Each structure stands twice: as C-alpha cells, then as structure tokens.
Design a protein around this nucleic acid. Structure first.
Ligand SMILES: [Mn+2]
Ligand SMILES: [Mn+2]
Length: 345
DNA sequence: CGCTAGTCGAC
DNA sequence: TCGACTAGCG
C-alpha cells in the first residue's frame, strides 16, 4: 500500500529508460504485468472461455526488455501470509459478488457498463501465472516463485546484488529497502526510477532518509501488515519520526499523540501490530536462488525471537521450497503439477 | 491551510 | 494492487 508514497518522495524520482540497465539483470514484480494483461481478457476469463491474452501481454514487456539487452527475472507470489490471510480471501467473496453485477447488467441492455464490472471482478490464480511461466521459460527468461510475497523476494534479489533494479507498480518495494525501483514503466521502456541513496533529496522527509526510519514511516502511514491510526498518513507519520530521535520506536509510538498535539490513545493491539508489521518487512521468508534454501529477508537482529515469527512465514524443508520456487508444486494442493528441471532441462 | 480519507474513471 | 479529485476537518 503506502498510499501516496511516490508523490511524498517525488523529489527522489528520475525519468529513465530500460536500456539503461543493458547487460545487467533486472527482477520484475510479474503480477503488475499479469494483472494489466487480465483486463484485456476479463470477460473470457470470467466465463470459463479459454484466453491467453494475458500471457502475451506479459511477454510484450519481456521482449521489450530483451531487445534492450537485459536479463529479466520474473518473480511470482507463492503462499499467503497470515498478516493478510483474511483480507486477501475477502477479495474472493467480494469477487464472486461482482461476478453477478457483470451478468445482471448484460441482462438489462447495458453492454459496456457490464464489460467494466468484469474488469473489477478479475482474479489472478496460480494457474494463470503458470502459463506466463511456461511462455517465459521457452524464451530463455528465468522465472522464480516467491515462497510468499514477491515483494520480499524481489527486495532480497536487489539487496543481494543479484539484480540491479526492480520493475513494479507497488511502492512497498521501497519500504522493504530496495536500492533501485522502477515504477510506471510502459511497453516502450519509459519509467520512473527511485534510488534509495537519492531519497535524501526530499526535504519533506528530513532525517527519515535511512532504511530503518523510512520503514517505520511507511508502517505508521498505513501498510498491508497494519492499518494506520485514525487520522495518520505520510505527512503525520514523517513528522513523528522527524521530531523524535530515540531509537526506541516503541516508546515513540506511545507518545505519538504528544508529538502531534493530538490526543489519540494507542491501543495495545497497535504496539504489538507495529512489531509484527516491522518484522514482516524485515524477516519475511524469501528464497535463495543459489544455495537453494529457505531464508529470511534479513539476518535476525539482537532483539528478535525467530521462533515467534510465524506470521512472517512458516519454514519448510528445502527440497519442498525448491519445487515451489520452480513453480512445479501447486501452492494450494501442494502436488506436483510440473516437472521442469533447471540443472538439466 | 495542510492532511487524511472517500469514491471514481480510465487503462 | 493506482492515482485523482473532493470532502470535511482538525
Ligand atoms: Mn505484491
Ligand atoms: Mn505490497
């Protein structure tokens, strides 16, 4: 989420072209593309009608990257985090309801008005994503399925030096601490890049240009792991961390009302929630594309009990994690739906 | 007036 | 999983 993040730090963005990273590797939040591609074929999908138009839409961007001589790494989402295990399934029940608003309008004469309700009732299943994987693999493009949120997986790849930048429309990658995030990129290669070190150009930020504070701000402004206090967005969240300088974030959150002259009592559920939200941005389970094992996004710091971070992702035997990352074992049924072999073919 | 939170339209 | 436009509203 981090609503309005891009604008809040517009002073850190720079119009660039994909050709910039020619000869280098770039990870991609494939969903961003896969989703847009689902729009061009919303009705056919919402009617069982076989359509692969979203498969071509994704390749349209991939080929555009390859033409500029770049090594694209398509990343996909795997399992679901308990942080939002309920708010994500709420989309399912809210989708099937919208599924009827698209049929009823077609039963009144309104055609285009119903063609829009289908777009608002789209669901990106792992079956669809798999078709995109098959298409990319044949072209020689590497695909990797994150154990949980592609966000964390992408972040790791960049922080690890494996990829130099990350293509996405989701600003959360910034919160995770990505060095180079390419946003709003079209089919021609025109996008808006945000560099972490170039964040200090935003005067409005002030002293919150460090990874630790910047992450704290995103959480306070309202994230996917925790909603912001009623009446607290970016400007407010930034001001709080800006005035205070005590590393003890817990004590700061308690006196949040004091720093803002607003007396909004903080519930105990928020103090605990901020801890979880912070630990999810820090130690969410990713996947090592080299040693082929299941590791956390970052190394556990001093004050953290790894045996209490279940909401960040459950650990699984490396042999199983490898099959999930290769998109061979269904996330849901946990059965082998493919036999792709990287070592050989 | 600056900020936050609401729904809305188009791609 | 987005921004845009606008409102009340501290
Ligand atoms: Mn995501
Ligand atoms: Mn996200």
């Amino acid at each position: 989420g981090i609503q309005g993040l891009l604008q809040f730090i517009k002073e850190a963005s720079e119009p660039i072209h994909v050709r910039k990273y020619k000869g280098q590797v770039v990870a991609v939040d494939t969903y961003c593309w896969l989703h847009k591609g689902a729009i061009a074929c919303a009705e056919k999908l919402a009617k069982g009608e076989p359509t692969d138009r979203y498969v071509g839409f994704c390749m349209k961007f991939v080929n555009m990257l390859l033409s500029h001589g770049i090594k694209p790494i398509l990343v996909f989402d795997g399992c679901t985090l308990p942080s939002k295990k309920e708010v994500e399934r709420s989309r399912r029940e809210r989708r099937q309801a919208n599924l009827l608003k698209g049929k009823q309008l077609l039963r009144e004469g309104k055609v285009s008005e119903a063609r829009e309700c289908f777009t608002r009732s789209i669901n990106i299943t792992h079956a669809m994503a798999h078709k995109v994987i098959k298409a990319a693999r044949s072209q020689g493009v590497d695909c990797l399925v994150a154990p949980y949120e592609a966000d964390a997986q992408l972040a790791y790849l960049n922080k690890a030096g494996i990829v130099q930048a990350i293509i996405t429309e989701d600003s959360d990658l910034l919160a995770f601490g990505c060095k180079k995030v390419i946003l709003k990129m079209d089919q021609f290669g025109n996008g808006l890049e945000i560099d972490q070190a170039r964040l200090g150009m935003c005067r409005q930020l002030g002293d919150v240009f460090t990874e630790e504070k910047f992450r704290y701000m995103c959480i306070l402004s309202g994230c996917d792991y925790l909603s912001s206090l009623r009446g607290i967005g970016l400007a407010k969240a930034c001001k709080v961390l800006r005035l205070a300088n005590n590393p003890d974030i817990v004590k700061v959150i308690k006196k949040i009302g004091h720093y803002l002259k607003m007396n909004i009592t903080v519930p105990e559920d928020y103090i605990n929630g901020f801890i979880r939200a912070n630990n999810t941005f820090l130690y969410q389970l990713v996947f090592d594309p080299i040693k082929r094992k299941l590791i956390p996004l970052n190394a556990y710091e001093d004050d953290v009990d790894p045996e209490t971070l279940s909401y960040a992702g459950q650990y699984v035997d490396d042999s199983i994690a490898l099959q999930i990352a290769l998109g061979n074992k269904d996330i849901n049924t946990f059965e082998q739906i493919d036999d792709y072999n990287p070592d050989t073919a």
